[PDB]
Design a protein around this ligand. Structure first.
Ligand SMILES: O=P(O)(OC[C@H](O)CO)OC[C@@H](O)CO
Ligand SMILES: O=P(O)(OC[C@H](O)CO)OC[C@@H](O)CO
Ligand SMILES: O=P(O)(OC[C@H](O)CO)OC[C@@H](O)CO
Ligand SMILES: O=P(O)(OC[C@H](O)CO)OC[C@@H](O)CO
Ligand SMILES: [Mg+2]
Ligand SMILES: [Mg+2]
Ligand SMILES: [Mg+2]
Ligand SMILES: [Mg+2]
Ligand SMILES: [Mg+2]
Ligand SMILES: [Mg+2]
Lengths: 252, 252
């Protein structure tokens, strides 16, 4: 498979998922319908999203690792799929939620070759391949902020910080893209419990890196060895080259 | 002037402001074009919104209290106007920003008779009059959550809190309505510097009160005496009757 295919497949999937979610009233969306292989509940919105996505994906030589249904398939290409990220927002009609896809030649993020995050409420399309990072077809790049006094997306603040702004939107996949296009200066998930899962962050990280960002684990450790499995968890410190180590110092 | 008038005026304003912002490219929206009477910079997006609003508003026998142009007019009905709340989200194409109007028979919040908050990105219309609180025409009400382990919007968290989720969206006017329709369980702005301004919160508070919420200042004291002037500042603690005092203890 190549990044050209990944784009088509992803775009095809975005269409069906967007269509499914939009046609579903909020009353329905918010209903708990099952237990997810990930160990959290599967809302109805999660379900109709995943089933739409899977039906397109199965047809490929991939191993899908997805939030509600767990690990599916045998293919040598691994696909980290959050069928619906920001599920909570979508149940309340809050317009920040996305489908997220990260394609990789192995079960490790270091071998990622395509990232896709598509805002299902606005139609904003983020992706990245070897040619760079895009938002609705246009090249993007992170910001050049040098001072800690910046615009931060941070899960979760637990003390007094020096940021200009803090925001928490509820879709890590989308929020990493907000950082990738430079809307925010950094993205931090520093929650002690290590909460982010591979399908939440993979596409977002890849897109953010191609956009020029430095994206690491909690102590600067590279993320290259993170696995496309259900047990994997992540902290993330993401910011441009200059700003990044200043942040690593700050949360120490 | 009556609550039916304010509805019409508000809708007329919403339309013209929605139009002005939509036709403005992000590159233009984000330019600083002046200093607001509020003491924070007026973005181009703020300016085009306010000019659109004032155009309609100053045809009325009102005193307008607005973010960029300050106190205008001389009528006996006071109008707290945030021509554009969530201005930062608007300059990044992040879909959580609104126009906010509160109409009052005196210069005090206790004499409010109409509240209006229109999400300029989604077209979701929140308002409230004597007949209750509405979202796109449908009645709304707050959540019956009883435990501190709930869904919170909190500016800004600075310690370990017991909430289920925390979110910060960047539009206090809109987020007050998220609480009012029960999307979230509580809204807290407990920033020690007292950052919120009259036009940021007035409409939101009214709508939330008309929807069953208890909405107070930091210590539980009534907000009824808060003034429609530029000098006024607020902390907010909003939750349903049960949850509310539990929150009051928590933040001491
Ligand atoms: O069921 P909800 O939508 O909460 C969603 C999360 O449990 C989903 O993982 O409603 C609010 C409370 O969390 C429920 O008691
Ligand atoms: O536990 P959270 O505070 O909130 C969870 C809800 O957003 C579930 O949809 O953070 C986790 C998010 O799911 C990460 O994208
Ligand atoms: O859009 P900004 O200019 O972004 C901050 C940095 O890029 C400036 O150095 O900040 C917004 C205004 O300060 C709000 O009043
Ligand atoms: O973190 P902030 O300083 O706080 C904003 C509050 O006044 C709520 O509307 O964000 C500032 C931006 O100017 C916003 O558009
Ligand atoms: Mg998800
Ligand atoms: Mg997720
Ligand atoms: Mg989920
Ligand atoms: Mg404003
Ligand atoms: Mg404001
Ligand atoms: Mg402003």
């Amino acid at each position: 498979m190549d990044e050209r295919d990944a784009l088509r497949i992803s775009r095809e999937i975005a269409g069906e998922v967007r269509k499914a979610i939009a046609s579903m009233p909020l009353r329905e969306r918010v209903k708990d319908v099952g237990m997810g292989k990930d160990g959290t509940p599967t809302k109805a919105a999660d379900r109709v999203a995943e089933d739409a996505a899977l039906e397109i994906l199965r047809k490929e030589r991939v191993t899908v690792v997805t939030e509600e249904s767990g690990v599916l398939g045998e293919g040598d290409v691994f696909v980290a799929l959050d069928p619906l990220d920001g599920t909570f927002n979508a149940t309340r009609g809050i317009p920040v939620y996305s489908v997220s896809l990260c394609f990789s030649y192995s079960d490790k993020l270091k071998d990622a070759f395509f990232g896709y995050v598509y805002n299902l409420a606005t139609g904003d399309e983020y992706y990245a391949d070897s040619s760079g990072a895009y938002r609705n077809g246009e090249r993007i790049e992170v910001s050049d902020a040098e001072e800690l006094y910046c615009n931060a997306i941070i899960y979760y603040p637990d003390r007094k910080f020096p940021f200009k702004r803090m925001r928490i939107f509820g879709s890590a996949a989308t929020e990493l893209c907000f950082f990738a296009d430079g809307s925010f200066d950094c993205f931090l998930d520093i929650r002690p419990g290590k909460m982010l899962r591979i399908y939440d962050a993979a596409a977002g990280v890849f897109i953010a890196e191609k956009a020029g960002g430095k994206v690491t684990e909690l102590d600067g450790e590279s993320l290259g060895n993170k696995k496309f499995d259900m047990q994997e968890r992540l902290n993330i410190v993401a910011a441009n080259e200059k700003l990044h180590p200043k942040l690593l110092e700050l949360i120490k």
